[PDB]
């Protein structure tokens, strides 16, 4: 017949470096446009307030 | 003033002092002159608003 009585102490030092990257997107609004345009008059009379 | 009640007088219609885009068979006073406009749909574009 035996009887074992025990005790423990403990430390722990945990250092962590986390890198993360995320790319969100919406399928309805993927792209935005921009046009570079000129206006040409090949006619004979001038035209005003051109839209 | 307009026997066909279209927005053009009898005299303008027989004289020719009219919008020339009026068809020639509509240049008779008993012939009405009016637009008929209807829209056709060539293509659909659906976009799923999912992000």
Curated annotation (Swiss-Prot), chain A:
Gene that produces this protein: pagA
Effect on the protein of changing residue 37 to C: Loss of capability to undergo conformational changes that lead to pore formation and translocation
Quaternary data: Homooligomer; homooligomerizes to form homoheptamers (PA-63(7)) or homooctamers (PA-63(8)). PA-63(7) or PA-63(8) form ring-shaped oligomers that are in a pre-pore conformation, which do not penetrate the host membrane. PA-63(8) displays an enhanced stability, suggesting that this form circulates in the blood to reach and exert toxicity even in distant tissues. Interacts with lethal factor (LF) and edema factor (EF); can bind LF and EF simultaneously and interaction takes place following homooligomerization on the host cell membrane.
Consequence the record notes for mutating residue 36 to D: In strain: PAI
Taxonomic lineage from the root: Bacteria, Bacillati, Bacillota, Bacilli, Bacillales
This protein's domain notes: To pass through this hydrophobic restriction, substrate proteins LF and EF need to be unfolded prior to translocation.
Function of the protein: Mature form that oligomerizes and forms a pore to translocate the enzymatic toxin components edema factor (EF) and lethal factor (LF) into the host cytosol. Following attachment to host cell receptors and cleavage by FURIN, homooligomerizes to form ring-shaped oligomers that are in a pre-pore conformation, and associates with EF and LF. Toxin-leaded complexes are then endocytosed in a clathrin-dependent process, followed by a conformational change of oligomerized PA-63 from the pre-pore to pore state, which is triggered by the low pH in the endosome.
Reported impact of residue 19 to A: Loss of toxicity probably due to faulty membrane insertion or translocation of LF/EF into the cytosol
Residues of the full protein shown: 357 to 407 of 764
Protein name as annotated: Protective antigen PA-63
């Amino acid at each position: 017949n035996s009887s074992t009585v025990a005790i423990d102490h403990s430390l722990s030092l945990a250092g962590e470096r986390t890198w993360a990257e995320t790319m969100g997107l919406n399928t309805a609004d993927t792209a935005r446009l921009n046009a570079n345009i000129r206006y040409v008059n090949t006619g004979t009379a001038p035209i005003y307030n051109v839209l | 003033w307009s026997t066909a009640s279209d927005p053009y007088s009898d005299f303008e219609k027989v004289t020719g002092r009219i919008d020339k885009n009026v068809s020639p068979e509509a240049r008779h006073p008993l012939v009405a002159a009016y637009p008929i406009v209807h829209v056709d749909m060539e293509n659909i574009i659906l976009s799923k608003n999912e992000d």
